Chain A
Amino acid sequence: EKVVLHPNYSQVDIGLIKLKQKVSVNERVMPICLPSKDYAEVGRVGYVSGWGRNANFKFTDHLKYVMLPVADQDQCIRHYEGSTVPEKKTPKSPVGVQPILNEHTFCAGMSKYQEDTCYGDAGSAFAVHDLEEDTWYATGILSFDKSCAVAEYGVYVKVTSIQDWVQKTIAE
């Protein structure tokens, strides 16, 4: 019924979609709500589910997932924007497209077996398992999925930074 974009779509690639009516919560349909704290600490291994291209670049007909660990957000920027100093920043993304990097992003590298996310996986959730509470929380939303196996870091939009804005839109 409605497709709401972010007020700053050039800084946070996030958009909310409203359905006409509520969807029944079956065993194959279940919402995942927002965390109260930040799980984007280096070493937090999270699961990413994807509907995008596979190693043959054809869209997958089955849902797949892979564990990706969060990475230090200095070597991610230096790998993409050349340096952490704004004056010396130059576009050197090994895929030819510059990711949108700022304080509302965190980068997750490849898995142990050299797995990553190619095109068509944007909008997916970087879900982490809170073993103490046994609940799945969304810590990031995939934004720059064009890295595939060439680059070494995928850019995810932090959920906590947009938690305040998401609640306001839902209320209306």
Chain B
Amino acid sequence: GSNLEMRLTRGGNMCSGRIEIKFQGRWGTVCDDNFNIDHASVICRQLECGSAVSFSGSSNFGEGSGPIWFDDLICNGNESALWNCKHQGWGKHNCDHAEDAGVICSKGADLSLRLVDGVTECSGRLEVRFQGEWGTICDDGWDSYDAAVACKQLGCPTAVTAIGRVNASKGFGHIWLD
């Protein structure tokens, strides 16, 4: 089916948002049931944006409108487009409009990490550049294991990893991760 079209809505960028598929001239959404990273990778590949950073359910991007096309679909991740891989039924759904699904690709995020306002180059407040904007990470759930992963990612040695910012001030802007 080459007539159908895929689009992402309410994501803040062309490569992120809630899935919107047009069929018979009507725009619809995919239910959150049985949504995996394989589904996200297939959608990101169809848009040709890039790899799939994550997937979001329960209509976090927004309460969608219109009908629901695909429900309980299973996609192995190899299929180029969602509409080609196997689904239980066409136009059939046990869901409502609080289960609309959405994906976030990797082209627009650029997903970098950095430290700001610390004593040295790799000890201080941690910031994340998501969608071209630099935000921070909440302290809840921040363990020494998370510090070790970040320290390796940036480049400084993982001999001693400690949580908490030093000498830095209260951050600014969004709080992306938590």
Contact = CB atoms under 8 A, between A and B. Distances in A.
The answer to A–B direct touch (Cβ < 8 A) is: yes
A3 B98 CA distance: 43
Interface string A26-64: 000000000000000000000000000000000000000
A85 B94 CA distance: 7
A92 to B, nearest CB: 12
**Chain B, interface SS category:** loop
Nearest to A75: B63
B119 interface: no
A83 interface: yes
13 contacts: A78-B96, A78-B98, A83-B96, A83-B98, A83-B99, A84-B96, A85-B94, A85-B95, A85-B96, A87-B94, A88-B94, A88-B95, A88-B96
A84 B98 CA distance: 9
Chain B interface size range = under 10
- The 10 A-B pairs of least Cβ separation, nearest first, read A84-B96, A83-B96, A85-B96, A78-B98, A85-B94, A83-B98, A87-B94, A85-B95, A78-B96, A88-B96
Contacts of B98: 78, 83
A155 B161 CA distance: 55
Interface residues of A, number: 6
A84 B96 CA distance: 7
Interface in B58-97: 94-96
B35 to A, nearest CB: 15
Nearest to B93: A85
Contacts of A83: 96, 98-99
Nearest to A86: B94
A100 B157 CA distance: 61
Contacts of B99: 83
Contacts of B96: 78, 83-85, 88
A26 to B, nearest CB: 50
Interface in A74-121: 78, 83-85, 87-88
Contacts of B94: 85, 87-88
Interface string A144-171: 0000000000000000000000000000
A162 B95 CA distance: 32
A83 B95 CA distance: 9
Among B94, B95, B96, B99, residue most surrounded by chain A Cβ atoms (within 10 Å): B96
A96 B57 CA distance: 26
Contacts of A84: 96
A83 B31 CA distance: 13
A77 to B, nearest CB: 10
A88 B94 CA distance: 9
A88 B31 CA distance: 13
A76 to B, nearest CB: 13
A87 B95 CA distance: 10
A88 B96 CA distance: 10
B58 to A, nearest CB: 11
B96 to A, nearest CB: 5
A156 B98 CA distance: 24
A83 B98 CA distance: 8
Interface in B89-115: 94-96, 98-99
Contacts of A78: 96, 98
Given A83-B99, A84-B96, A85-B96, 7 more contacts: A78-B96, A78-B98, A83-B96, A83-B98, A85-B94, A87-B94, A88-B95
